[PDB]
Ligand SMILES: CC(=O)N[C@@H]1[C@@H](O)[C@H](O[C@@H]2O[C@H](CO)[C@@H](O)[C@H](O)[C@H]2NC(C)=O)[C@@H](CO)O[C@@H]1O
Ligand SMILES: [Cl-]
């Protein structure tokens with residue numbers, strides 16, 4: 001599924017990401033925009049052979065099991081394919097674990113490089129939330 005911006009904002013808000021660990025909703029929408037272009041089916045292979053999955057491009061090195069990232073962890077205790085669902089619950093719940101792990105949203109490279117320190121509220125501007 002390719003979410004609309006506000007649609008995703010609303011879904012993320014319903015799933016408790018607004019101000020989750022102090023990260024306003026726009027952070028999450030911004031991260032999703034630049035990680036996946038709001039596409040739940042996005043996958044990208046990393047240099048180490050892990051793959052990033054889903055709307056928040058959660059990687060299989062640490063967070064999910066894709067059966068092809070040897071020596072990796074599965075800290076969200078999910079098949080990575082669950083992160084490709086049109087239902088973002090699994091991604092959100094995993095993202096909550098990630099962002100809670102001490103490094104905040106810096107785990108999301110795109111967020112660090114493209115959202116952090118920007119006016120992320122712009123990402124939820126105009127949305128009915
Ligand atoms: C939370 C999450 O999974 N974020 C992804 C990053 O982990 C990806 O960064 C890449 O992660 C792999 C596995 O840890 C690293 O081996 C790799 O060096 C790292 N790549 C960079 C440029 O830091 C990122 C890839 O675009 O995608 C999500 O942000
Ligand atoms: Cl867009």
Ligand SMILES: [Cl-]
Nearest residue numbers: 024025026121
């Ligand atoms: Cl915001």
Ligand SMILES: [Cl-]
Nearest residue numbers: 067068069070
């Ligand atoms: Cl694996």
Ligand SMILES: [Cl-]
Nearest residue numbers: 011087088089
């Ligand atoms: Cl959803």
Ligand SMILES: [Cl-]
Nearest residue numbers: 021103104105
């Ligand atoms: Cl933080």
Ligand code: NA
Nearest residue numbers: 035052057110
């Ligand atoms: Na990425």
Ligand code: NA
Nearest residue numbers: 060064072073
């Ligand atoms: Na894994």
